[PDB]
Amino acid sequence: KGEAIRIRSILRSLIPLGDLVGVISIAFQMPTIAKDGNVVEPDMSAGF
Amino acid sequence: DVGVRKEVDGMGTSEIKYGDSVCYIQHVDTGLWLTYQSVDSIQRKAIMHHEGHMDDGISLSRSQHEESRTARVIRSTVFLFNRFIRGLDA
Amino acid sequence: EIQFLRTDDEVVLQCTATIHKEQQKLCLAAEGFGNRLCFLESTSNSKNVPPDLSICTFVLEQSLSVRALQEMLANHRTLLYGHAILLRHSYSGMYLCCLSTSRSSTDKLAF
Amino acid sequence: NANVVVRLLIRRPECFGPALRGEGGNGLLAAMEEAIKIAEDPSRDGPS
Numbered sequence A: 001k002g003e004a005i006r007i008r009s010i011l012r013s014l015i016p017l018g019d020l021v022g023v024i025s026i027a028f029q030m031p032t033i034a035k036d037g038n039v040v041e042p043d044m045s046a047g048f
Numbered sequence B: 001d002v003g004v005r006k007e008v009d010g011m012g013t014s015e016i017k018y019g020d021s022v023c024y025i026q027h028v029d030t031g032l033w034l035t036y037q038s039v040d041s042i043q044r045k046a047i048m049h050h051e052g053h054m055d056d057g058i059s060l061s062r063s064q065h066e067e068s069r070t071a072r073v074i075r076s077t078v079f080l081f082n083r084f085i086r087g088l089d090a
Numbered sequence C: 001e002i003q004f005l006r007t008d009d010e011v012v013l014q015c016t017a018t019i020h021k022e023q024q025k026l027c028l029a030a031e032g033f034g035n036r037l038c039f040l041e042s043t044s045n046s047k048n049v050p051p052d053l054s055i056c057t058f059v060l061e062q063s064l065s066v067r068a069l070q071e072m073l074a075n076h077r078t079l080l081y082g083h084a085i086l087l088r089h090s091y092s093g094m095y096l097c098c099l100s101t102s103r104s105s106t107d108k109l110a111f
Numbered sequence D: 001n002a003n004v005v006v007r008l009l010i011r012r013p014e015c016f017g018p019a020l021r022g023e024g025g026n027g028l029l030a031a032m033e034e035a036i037k038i039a040e041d042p043s044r045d046g047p048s
Helices: A002-014 A017-025 B065-089 C066-074 D002-011 D028-040
Strands: A032-034 A038-040 B033-036 B046-049 C014-019 C022-030 C038-042 C058-060 C087-089
Touching: A002 D002, A017 D028
Parallel strands: none
Antiparallel strands: A032 A038, B033 B046, C014 C022, C022 C038, C058 C087
């Protein structure tokens, strides 16, 4: 469907593949167990 | 000196004919006529004369599309290759 | 009686650009031989620099409808708004096209 | 609906934000990294 190929080509032009690969490669911030057995979990609504 | 008539928007009317018509080339500003110097591969130098000569009419021969395209290709390739040669010399 | 744009006609595409507070006229052009990409030729400065309309002229080959176009790639008409037109370069004999490649002049989204 | 939405969004390229707008807009990976830097840098993430 020429319209379908056209839309897919447009989306490919907007978003490069390498950008998606890099964003996926970005790592999170692991929760850390600290002294006295306390879990420090960074706020989800404040980070990645 | 009929002058310059009004500009017409359209294909116009057919006035100057290839081969049949006889034309005289005149400079617009100075008004001089383009003539032959008649001085001694004919190699007759072309000049501008206020009055001209007795035989100054020019006939027209349209070039073929193939020849015109070849000439323009020649010009473009000459320009590009001269640029390339100058770059290599630089 | 205003003249109407037919198919088998030779025309030029013009655009007006207001750069450095000056309104001058440009025309789309293409060399064809050795350089497929299109560019612009200034026509406002005609009294000082002659424009090269030979590489600017185009000819309208077909002006068939959009659905007719889809049917066509599935297997002296007057131009009407909404038709798909074919522009053949008068000099090179080539056709105006949307090249897939892009020069990427800070646009990153245009062809 | 998807075709219409894509067409409207590409007609108005400002809908994609600073990045992905082109004309000097950096990449999506760069935008994500800068947003992460903002998230872990106070005085730019909250009101303060």
